[PDB]
Design a protein around this ligand. Structure first.
Ligand SMILES: Cc1cccc(-c2ccc(-c3cc4cnc(NC(CO)CO)nc4n(CCCCN)c3=O)c(Cl)c2)n1
Ligand SMILES: Cc1cccc(-c2ccc(-c3cc4cnc(NC(CO)CO)nc4n(CCCCN)c3=O)c(Cl)c2)n1
Lengths: 264, 262
């Protein structure tokens, strides 16, 4: 975190994107390069208790250097305001892409393949994303897929061993990926019609979810492979990149531009 | 071209690196000098009518002496098989380096600068590469960047005047397409039938770099991609472009990108 440079002089704040975690997020411009950036502004006089969580996500993001993880450019402290500068992705999130009707299996497999590449990077680096879900998968305007919004070290995407507050590892992300696969196919995770506190006990207690509907058997088997109650029986991201569903259906990421355009 | 010595004695093939143009290509060793080489073997009966193109590419490589152009060591004819011996580069092509993910602008500028050094050498020697594209830019294990696979005298990288019938400015246009390729993964009109692209390049406005790239990188592409060849800058001029000056780094920096590819 840089305390001397004035971020209001280095960056031009443009449109508010949304109410992000702990702050507001803006589309901005790097004045020196004219690249578009994403700018999160957090009032530190207001979010006292959450500060440790903010520092930890900055630390993890600063240790990542992958085309599948949104790049962290730096942070600045101006008066009581912490400015966090990130890579801007102009294609929306995967959740945004679900709003009208269904993804087809080609779209699902392409998106999942890129998420798997991000998870393979993270797991090979001994990191855990901890909040894999469509709302945290961001797309560029040309279809590149990147992970954002790491979880802190709502229950619908949480693995059973996470909910039971046991130790967990990279296999927790694999379960969340399986829920995210269902989300990409159905628009919502399993149990989304139930109160979160009820889902809290349902996930450890119940059989794992399965993907129901008219889907090709490999897509159902992909979901089944991810959603195993036993974490050590879930495959790695590297192995899932060779799953028949991925190899048979995933296409060049640039084909997502059609879907992205249709939502912009 | 040596007809007396037997290349299966002078060279040890180590591994097939891939198929090339007209023939299979191997990583091998010169047993006399004990240095690794690249070996292309062309069957001159199977490849008849391409022979003049083969000869023209041997001639132009044999006249180049630059660290920015793959060295030509000589050729051997055994029965109907022509062995072409060249410098071996162990880091892959620039196109290969596009595989494990998007290239950032520091990577792009470093590669473009080295390509421009090669083009400046060639153009100053009154030569034209004629097939500048990521697939024909090769990297050493240590990040050095060299031109290979010259064109002789697929349209996506071709200048409009080459399509319509040129000089060194054709390479500058192809360099601009290659900059787009390094930034986006593929040249403009990648999805279209090559015969459509044949009329589109002369007809249409020149391509621009679209997306969230720095203004200098976009300006570099625009400078290369001028429909008028005489308005494209020399390679020497482009070495001073703001994009190159602000982003290019030592070639050794690419070793991490090359290692990630392995
Ligand atoms: C507490 C903490 C600590 C360290 C880093 C962060 C942090 C994390 C995500 C972003 C971020 C980066 C970002 C980049 N691009 C975009 N465009 C998309 C929005 O859908 C298209 O406009 N939105 C972004 N959105 C909004 C959408 C979030 C969805 N989960 C962002 O919030 C940012 Cl700017 C910062 N936060
Ligand atoms: C008709 C003709 C006439 C005169 C010369 C040639 C000729 C041209 C290129 C090479 C050559 C030389 C060479 C040297 N190093 C490498 N390794 C890299 C490439 O991926 C890492 O293995 N590959 C090489 N590849 C394979 C990759 C080519 C990409 N377009 C080669 O083909 C060779 Cl050995 C000869 N051809």
């Amino acid at each position: 975190t840089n305390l001397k440079a004035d971020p209001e002089e280095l960056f031009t704040k443009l449109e508010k994107i949304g109410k992000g975690s702990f702050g507001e997020v803006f589309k901005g411009i790097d004045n020196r390069t004219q690249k578009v950036v994403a700018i999160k502004i957090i009032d530190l006089e207001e979010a006292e208790d959450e500060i440790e969580d903010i520092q930890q996500e900055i630390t993890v993001l600063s240790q990542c250097d992958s085309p599948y993880v949104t790049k962290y450019y730096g942070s600045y402290l101006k008066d009581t305001k912490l400015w966090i500068i990130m890579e801007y992705l102009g294609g929306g999130s995967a959740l945004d892409l679900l709003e009208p009707g269904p993804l087809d299996e080609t779209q699902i497999a392409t998106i999942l393949r890129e998420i798997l590449k991000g998870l393979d990077y993270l797991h090979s680096e001994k990191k855990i994303h901890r909040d894999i879900k469509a709302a945290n998968v961001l797309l560029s305007e040309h279809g590149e897929v990147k992970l954002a919004d790491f979880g802190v070290a709502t229950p619908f995407w949480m693995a059973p061993e996470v909910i039971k507050q046991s130790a967990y590892d990279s296999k927790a992300d694999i379960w969340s990926l399986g829920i995210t696969a269902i989300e990409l196919a159905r628009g919502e995770p399993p149990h989304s019609e139930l109160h979160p506190m009820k889902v809290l006990f349902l996930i450890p207690k119940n059989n794992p979810p399965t993907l129901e509907g008219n889907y090709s058997k490999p897509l159902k088997e992909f979901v089944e492979a991810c959603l195993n109650k036993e974490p050590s029986f879930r495959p790695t991201a590297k192995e899932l990149l060779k799953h028949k569903f991925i190899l048979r259906n995933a296409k060049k990421t640039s084909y997502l531009t059609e879907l992205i355009d249709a939502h912009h």
